[PDB]
């Protein structure tokens, strides 16, 4: 029904990651099917699904710019940035762990888009 929310979880949610190093990013980017062609930058949010959904309402979200929402709470995140010249696999990634609020778009109370711009660096 809300398959864009499914896509969001697939691309942008990893509940309990462990060690969030380069080899983490390389494995998860492959497993979530984000490596043909290699996604240039991708952030996974960690922790509770409830907290993420809550960004779609006043509970854990504020309106942001045009059509976006921004979280009140800070999340543990890991950003996977592609390195090398090639857009095609194998896809080597550098991992950047973080802890901050996130920017999403919501539809019908569910996140369907992560704004990756805030993780570029």
Swiss-Prot record:
Resulting phenotype, residue 53 to R: Found in a patient with Parkinson disease; uncertain significance
Keyword entries, A-Z: Amyotrophic lateral sclerosis, Angiogenesis, Cytoplasm, Developmental protein, Differentiation, Disease variant, Disulfide bond, DNA-binding, Endonuclease, Hydrolase, Neurodegeneration, Nuclease, Nucleus, Protein synthesis inhibitor, Pyrrolidone carboxylic acid, Secreted, Signal, Stress response
Impact reported for residue 111 to L: In ALS9; loss of angiogenic activity; reduced tRNA ribonucleolytic activity; unable to translocate to the nucleus
GO biological process, any: signal transduction
Localization per record: Secreted; Nucleus; Nucleus, Nucleolus; Cytoplasm, Stress granule
Impact after mutating residue 79 to A: Increased ribonuclease activity
Main location: secreted
Consequence of substituting residue 11 to A: Slightly decreases binding affinity for RNH1
Family: Belongs to the pancreatic ribonuclease family.
Protein name (database record): Angiogenin
Annotated source species: Homo sapiens
Portion of the parent chain present: 26 to 146 of 147
């Amino acid at each position: 029904d809300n398959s864009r929310y499914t896509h969001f979880l697939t691309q942008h949610y990893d509940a309990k990651p462990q060690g969030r190093d380069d080899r983490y990013c390389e494995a998860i980017m492959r497993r979530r099917g984000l490596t043909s062609p290699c996604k240039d930058i991708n952030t996974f949010i960690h922790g509770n699904k409830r907290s993420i959904k809550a960004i779609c309402e006043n509970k854990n979200g504020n309106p942001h710019r045009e059509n976006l929402r921004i979280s009140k709470s800070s999340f543990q995140v890991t950003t996977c940035k592609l390195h090398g010249g090639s857009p095609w696999p194998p896809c080597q990634y550098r991992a950047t762990a973080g802890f901050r609020n996130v920017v999403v778009a919501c539809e019908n109370g569910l996140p369907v888009h992560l704004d990756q711009s805030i993780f570029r660096r």
